[PDB]
Design a protein around this ligand. Structure first.
Ligand code: ADP
Ligand code: ADP
Ligand code: BEF
Ligand code: BEF
Ligand code: K
Ligand code: K
Ligand code: MG
Ligand code: MG
Lengths: 607, 613
């Protein structure tokens, strides 16, 4: 049962001390270089972020002083022979005291102090990336020594020399000839020589620092060519740049069928763009124009992973390793806002273009169905349910109707939605269960796509209306001649056809097959891959065949019954298969090829 | 315009000055309590791990001298009305000096010192979890006031008081009435009061701390119920015990049909167990987008990023590994160099395990392949390395025409009895073996005498194309082999060219075939495997311009012989049967996609075919 020793017998009887928490660097450097960042090559990304922050600070200072704006760029150099990578910027610069304060202290960031000493939050607060003060020390996991050439931009400041080796001790000195800005020299480790190649650095910049506000040069060439098209006015940016941007973030070659540029910032300063791929069967998270994660399976729901684009926000909380704070107290609100906006955007797409949405729905229908089944809160399913499209029995085939518009013509007296899950419309329009509903003027929705039954059962409600399935409710031949025509038909097709009746709704089809077990009809369709032997499928399904006396084939069978008994049996077996093919019960007519070939040879014997 | 500002004009001018790296206490605490752990619920997990480490230290200390071992017990106490949670253990305990050295100094812990003091790294090195020294500070995320009582288990130690509000300043005093072990009092924040409920603590602990090496009690109630059966000898754990552990990780009420208890040490300290569910996987579940990572019996909750191969997502289990590196947030280092070796090693072991099961119980493996065979097909298609493709190919099972029905053969044994004179493997796709025997492709293939594989499941044909090679033998389908490799000439030639006149909009070239015996016609495609896949998933004039169907007829067949008199007796009916013959050959290829109009033309043809009877 319960056995606990919890008690409050402890008492305070000593003298209290007052001393600060101790904080050394021997273990902090080891943690940063061994157990801080999940992946190795993020160190030059952090260096580029620091350079961009310095350039932004210098630009703010220059525009505050109201003077000219000189050149400001980030230059990347990599010597393959020397095995070193050089990054140099022309930012504000750092003095002796500034170097000691920032570089020599763990987590002490001058960017945060600059932000606190800004007091406007509109000029350059959003462009400052550095917030933790540990970005620079990421270079110690790949370098045995780091050389920094930093000089402040003040009119009279002198350069300084900074040395370190990652062992918790740094030897700062004085340097001459250092130009304005900061120059960092990194000597790669023996095991980390892979960063000495230009291609790797180019890949890193394209992955992470491809949207830096300032020009970036690697060995003297500029390759950004992407000025953060999501940060400007959606009206200003054209549709031509959307295709090029989509092909980059999604790593695809097709075009986006839809373009949603969301910029309204209710919960957070969200600047996101969403694309829908054309290729029918993933969003890259950004923060202050710096990539966070390529996959980002948290900001968006799983069922919305089919879209592509980026989500950039300048106020989301980031982890120490510059990764998203998963499932934070505020991130969950972002997912609901993004899901609601995308759902609303999709609804507006259907109204403005029904045909385009129908093509879109038939391409990503499984994604919408996946969300409803996997959704937890009921009202969330209602918004996704509005995206579903179904064809009703009261409207001609080929046009899809939404669930919301289905209730528009629904009677006030009726309170439950009727849906039928069938492989195709031919079986649904002829099933006796639908005929029971067809007696009244009510309409029933038809579900054809796979997993529709699971989605409808999981949804269980729409617009305060209970979801209930129909299955859970429960010129012409003479009459005398047609009577014995079926009697012989049930002999040859006793195992397959349960019974044959009279049909007056066949314009040009000699027969149709109809089923009373649409639930088991999908079982018949699902057995087209495993164990579809002819001698077995008849018993598991047991369908009924309907024929019309107004067709030539049915009329012709009267004389062939007695004149050519051998041909009569084969022809009836052929016409029964044709009904299944027309009704869609068989995925492919491969089995009927064997008997059809042997039928035509004797059908033209006199010819 | 290549311009750069990189140069070497910089040079040293002055002399170096002695300096040492420093750290900001307030910023470090703020970062730890605000931007270190994604989940605010992991502070109790970190404190439980610390308590377990302390208990392990006490156990090692009291077995080193070989005296009586005291009881091991850990308490998780929560007060809803007070909004506080109490964590008490019976660990080694900390004196004032130990408290100021460990608690008062950021990132340094006695666990690393204890590990270095082992001098053996064989007794308690596998049970120590704390390695970063910042686990305790995770409590400040939800606590604005931390009260700690601790005292060492030394013979004559005294209790102490430890208070900290997370502001970087902590006060230490001497406390009376404290017993052996460390007791921690956490005062929850106003906005972080959700952790004051029993259910929250219970579900977080069951998420993170199921397999603690020592008993854990929530308000005096034991809540472990598991003993981490993946640690001891695999023969020690029984078959029934596997099911009990299966019901937790798999979150299902069924039983595992397979069990792979993997314990290797040469490439990595791996103690992993994998279960194969006995139930058929759900189609909806398969279309949606596995194993649980464990380190020192502590969950890493890194199920994402596919640590396990995607085609192996159908198995459930845990992968315990103590030598893997973790970041500060106690999470897996994503895209690490060492973690990629874990995926390759596990994949090879799982592939070998499935091969052994097939050789052990062939009948049982046949049912397993009929259920989870789609995963193997997907993996070969999605594989980026060629060598990986053949390894998964051993798990594929097919039946050939040589042996009777009911027995399945692997790709490896197929080449054993295959003739060594050709570097080709022949496979045929058909819904049934019976249909495969009577397929036109097999009939034309009967000229040669080689065994041919039969593919029945979906996407099986695409798997062979992606594999493209097995044991240095090419994979060529029957239809591919045909294209690459009585009626007189005068009567056949005029009919052969006449068909192209009416079938020009559908077919391109028609040739004579001497291999077909009981099939009027057949169609060959240069790349039929891609053609079938193109018209199946992604999907007449719009397709005939790219498909290029190379139809070919058999002069020996009666239908082709009958076309000679039919073309002359009534021109108006000959083209209808030719279209039907072309349609029949199209169906046998599997390239038919819209058979809605096929029945309409077929039924209409029979109207005037024999109406004079
Ligand atoms: N290239 C540079 N030019 C000027 N200052 C820099 C440069 N790189 C880093 N710094 C300074 O070093 C400090 C610490 O940066 P770092 O440790 O990389 O993390 P963070 O950028 O988050 O502060 C920052 O406050 C920044 O001002
Ligand atoms: N419940 C506890 N009992 C005894 N010692 C503890 C307890 N919790 C923490 N400690 C001590 O505090 C030190 C630092 O712990 P922590 O900051 O959690 O980092 P780590 O998890 O790496 O030990 C450890 O050396 C450990 O001895
Ligand atoms: F660049 Be630091 F990690 F904020
Ligand atoms: F548990 Be500590 F972060 F090593
Ligand atoms: K710093
Ligand atoms: K500590
Ligand atoms: Mg930074
Ligand atoms: Mg800890």
């Amino acid at each position: 049962p319960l056995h606990s020793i919890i008690s409050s017998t402890e008492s305070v009887q000593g003298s209290t001390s007052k001393h600060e928490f101790q904080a050394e660097t021997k273990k902090l450097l080891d943690i940063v270089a061994r157990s801080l960042y999940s992946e190795k090559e993020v160190f030059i990304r952090e260096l580029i972020s620091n350079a961009s922050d310095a350039l932004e600070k210098l630009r703010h200072k220059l525009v505050s002083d109201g003077q000219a704006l000189p050149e400001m760029e980030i230059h990347l150099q990599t010597n393959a022979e020397k095995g070193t990578i050089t990054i140099q910027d022309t930012g504000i610069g750092m003095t002796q005291e500034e170097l000691v304060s920032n570089l020599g202290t763990i987590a002490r960031s001058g960017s945060k102090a600059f932000l606190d000493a800004l007091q406007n939050q509109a000029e350059a607060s959003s462009k400052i990336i550095g917030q933790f003060g540990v970005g620079f020390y990421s270079a110690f996991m790949v370098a045995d020594r780091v050389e920094v050439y930093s000089r402040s931009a003040a009119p009279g400041s002198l350069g300084y020399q900074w040395l370190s080796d990652g062992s918790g001790v740094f030897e700062i000195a004085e340097a001459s000839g250092v130009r304005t800005g900061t120059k960092i020299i990194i000597h790669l480790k023996s095991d980390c020589k892979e960063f000495s190649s230009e291609a790797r650095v180019r890949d890193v910049v394209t992955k992470y620092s491809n949207f830096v506000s300032f020009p970036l040069y690697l060995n003297g060439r500029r390759m950004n060519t992407l000025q953060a098209i999501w940060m400007m006015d959606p009206k200003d940016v054209g549709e031509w740049q959307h295709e090029e941007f989509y092909r980059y973030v999604a790593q695809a070659h097709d075009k986006p069928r839809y373009t949603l540029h969301y910029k309204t910032d209710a919960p957070l300063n969200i600047r996101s763009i969403f694309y829908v791929p054309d290729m029918k069967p993933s969003v890259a998270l950004y923060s202050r124009k710096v990539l966070i994660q390529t996959k980002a399976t948290d900001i968006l729901p799983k069922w919305l992973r089919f879209i592509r684009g980026v989500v950039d926000s300048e106020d989301i909380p980031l982890n120490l390793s510059r990764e998203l704070l998963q499932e934070s107290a505020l991130i969950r609100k972002l997912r609901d806002v993004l899901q609601q906006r995308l759902i609303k955007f999709f609804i507006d797409q259907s109204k403005k273009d029904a045909e385009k949405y129908a093509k879109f729905f038939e391409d990503y229908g499984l994604f919408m169905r996946e969300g409803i089944v996997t959704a937890t809160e009921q009202e969330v399913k209602e918004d996704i349910a509005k995206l579903l499209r179904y064809e009703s029995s009261a409207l001609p085939s080929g046009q899809l109707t939404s669930l919301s518009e289905y209730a528009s013509r629904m009677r006030a007296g009726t309170r439950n939605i009727y849906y039928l899950c069938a492989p195709n419309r031919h079986l649904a329009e002829h099933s006796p269960y639908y005929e029971a509903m067809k007696k009244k003027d009510t309409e029933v929705l038809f579900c054809f796509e796979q997993f529709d039954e699971l989605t409808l059962l999981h949804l269980r409600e729409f617009d305060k209306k209970k979801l209930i399935s129909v299955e859970t409710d429960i010129e012409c031949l003479s009459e005398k001649e047609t009577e014995e025509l079926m009697a012989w038909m049930r002999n040859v097709l006793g195992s397959r056809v349960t019974n044959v009746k009279v049909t007056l709704r066949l314009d040009t089809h000699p027969a149709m097959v109809t089923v009373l077990e649409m639930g088991a009809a999908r079982h018949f369709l699902r057995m087209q891959q495993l164990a579809k032997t002819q001698e077995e499928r008849a018993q598991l399904l047991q369908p009924t065949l309907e024929i019309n006396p107004r067709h030539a084939l049915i009329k012709k069978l009267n004389q062939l019954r007695a004149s050519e008994p051998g041909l009569a049996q084969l022809l009836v077996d052929q016409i029964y298969e044709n009904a299944m093919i027309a009704a869609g019960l068989v995925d492919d007519p491969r089995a009927m090829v064997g008997r059809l070939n042997e039928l035509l040879v004797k059908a033209l014997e006199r010819h």
